[PDB]
C-alpha cells in the first residue's frame, strides 16, 4: 500500500531485479511486480527494493495499463540513475 520512490544507478545494463505481470497476464490484477532482487539490485537500491513491490513508474513514464513487453521495454530503455515509483507488496 505504501508508495515510495527508489533511485538505482544501472550497471551492466541492469537494475538487478526481475519483473512479472502485465494487463494481459494472469499475475495478480495486471500490474508489474518485482519478482526477484539479486545482490546487484540490493546494492543499487541500498536495500530499498523488494520482491513483491509493484512498479508504478519508470522515470517520467507511468506503467499504468502496460503489457509485459511494454514494461520490460520501458525498464530496459533507460540508463544512468533510474527512478522507480513503487508500492509495497
Amino acid at each position: 500500500g505504501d508508495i515510495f520512490e527508489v533511485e538505482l544507478a544501472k550497471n551492466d545494463n541492469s537494475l538487478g531485479i526481475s519483473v512479472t505481470g502485465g494487463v494481459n497476464t494472469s499475475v495478480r490484477h495486471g500490474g508489474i511486480y518485482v519478482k526477484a532482487v539479486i545482490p546487484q539490485g540490493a546494492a543499487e537500491s541500498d536495500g530499498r527494493i523488494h520482491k513483491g513491490d509493484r512498479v508504478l513508474a519508470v522515470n517520467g513514464v507511468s506503467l499504468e495499463g502496460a503489457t509485459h513487453k511494454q514494461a520490460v521495454e520501458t525498464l530496459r530503455n533507460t540508463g544512468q540513475v533510474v527512478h522507480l515509483l513503487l508500492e509495497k507488496g
Binding site: 531485479i17 526481475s18 519483473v19 512479472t20 494472469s26 509485459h68
Partner: peptide, 8 residues
C-alpha cells in the same frame, strides 16, 4: 498457471 519472468 504460467507466467514470464524477465530480468532487467
Amino acid at each position: 498457471g504460467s507466467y514470464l519472468v524477465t530480468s532487467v
